[PDB]
């Protein structure tokens, strides 16, 4: 009926879990009636909804955004920052979801004054993207280095404490 | 139902019209196409807004994901890579991008694929249009391989939905 296939230890797959968490936390809320996809872990990213099949991260993400009617929430249409949200997530996908140390510098500075990478209100699609991308480099980071990126860390644990839910499989830090 | 609303003089909308033209030439009931202020798509009871929501819906409905992304050649990721970088740079190219593009296309027929045009050809075509359009002759030849590729897309993809005037 509604089956999402993902992959273990894959950033793209983490993202699709965290969206389902963002969707549960932010969009449908205490409404128990809404149905969520069965999640399975196999080797490629497919999504089976009704008679239609969707493939890989992008086709699936846009399928999901559609079903849960959560474009506005995710892309911050309310603030007129759709294109700015897009610019960030596309740039990341472009760089195969990896961040150079010069990117962390740009990010950490940015997060000093911001609660969220793009939005001035709530977490967007972009916070979800970079969360999943910075997770490994962050989990491996020695204490001395972590304080050099204190703002990223301050932003990180906040997304962790507020969006991470049922579907997210990554172990919690601290 | 099935009405696509686009914008005149909009690189983004040019991409969508060319996408539809690609569908007719390479893959084969088409949407009514209208021009307003904002890109929207009305299909069934669903309304999709902007380029990527519309593009992905149109991909889904026309089941042309494989063709547009070269699933065949395992270049799905590589295609995604080019269109996303381009969209990120707000659809503009640095002149070092043109030199690199011109170079890549000396030895290829299409930017990513080794077979037919992909979404990447569509995306870049509509983006490089104006500079090429405004280019004096001597620096058209300075980027001859792009020009060759460009005119090729023009002669094999451009159709009913495209509003762009043809060059040479």
Q: Edge-to-edge strand order for the sheet containing A46-49?
A: A38-41, A2-6, A46-49, A52-55
Domain layout of chain A by residue ranges: 2-162
CATH topology classification for B3-156: Glutathione S-transferase Yfyf (Class Pi); Chain A, domain 2 (1.20.1050)
Residues of A in contact with B46 (CB under 8 A): 66
Do A135 and A172 meet the contact criterion of CB atoms below 8 Å apart?
Answer: no
Q: From the CA of A121, how many Å to the nearest CA of chain B?
A: 22
User: Which among B48, B53, B80 has the least Cβ separation from residue A93?
Assistant: B80
At A90, which helix (H) or strand (E)?
A: helix A82-94
Question: Chain A contact for B60, CB < 8 A?
Answer: yes
Q: According to DSSP H, which parts of chain B are helical?
A: 11-22, 50-62, 65-69, 76-88, 95-104, 119-133, 137-140, 144-156
Residues of A in contact with B85 (CB under 8 A): 90-91, 94
Q: CB under 8 Å to B97, separation ≥6 — which residues?
A: none
Q: How far apart are the first and last CA of chain B?
A: 38
Tell me whether residues A59 and B57 touch, CB distance under 8 A. Answer: no
Do A42 and B43 meet the contact criterion of CB atoms below 8 Å apart?
Answer: no
Do A60 and A49 meet the contact criterion of CB atoms below 8 Å apart?
Answer: no
Tell me whether residues A93 and B87 touch, CB distance under 8 A. Answer: no
Q: How far apart are the first and last CA of chain A?
A: 38
Q: Is the four-CA dihedral A7, A104, A90, B110 of positive or negative sign? A: negative
Partner residues linked to B36 by β-bridges? B7
DSSP assignment of A132-162: HHHHHHHHT--HHHHTTTHHHHHHHHHHHHH
B44 SS3 class: coil
Range A135-139 contact pairs with CB under 8 angstroms and sequence separation of 24 or more: A135/A11, A135/A14, A135/A170, A137/A99, A137/A104, A138/A173, A139/A173
Residues of B in contact with A81 (CB under 8 A): none
CATH topology classification for A2-162: Glutathione S-transferase Yfyf (Class Pi); Chain A, domain 2 (1.20.1050)
Partner residues linked to B102 by β-bridges? none
Q: Edge-to-edge strand order for the sheet containing B32-36?
A: B32-36, B3-7, B40-43, B46-49
At A46, which helix (H) or strand (E)?
A: strand A46-49
In chain B, residues 115-134 whose CB comes closer than 8 Å to chain A: none
Tell me whether residues B52 and A86 touch, CB distance under 8 A. Answer: yes
């Amino acid at each position: 009926m509604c089956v999402l296939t993902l992959v273990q230890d894959d950033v793209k797959s983490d993202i699709l879990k965290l969206v389902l968490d963002f969707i549960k936390a932010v969009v449908v809320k205490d409404d128990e009636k809404v149905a969520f996809p069965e999640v399975r872990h196999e080797k490629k990213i497919s999504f089976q909804y009704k008679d239609k099949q969707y493939k890989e991260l992008f086709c699936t993400l846009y399928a999901i955004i559609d079903i849960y009617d959560c474009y506005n929430e995710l892309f911050n249409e309310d603030e007129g920052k759709v294109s700015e949200n897009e610019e960030f997530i596309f740039h990341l996908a472009s760089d195969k979801f990896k961040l150079k140390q010069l990117d962390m510098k740009h990010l950490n500075d940015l997060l000093c004054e911001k609660s969220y990478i793009v939005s001035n209100r709530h977490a967007s699609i972009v916070d979800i993207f970079y969360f999943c991308s910075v997770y490994k480099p962050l989990s491996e980071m020695p204490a001395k280095e972590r304080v050099e990126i204190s703002h990223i860390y301050r932003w990180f644990l906040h997304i962790q404490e507020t969006l991470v839910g049922k579907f997210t499989t990554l172990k919690k830090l601290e």
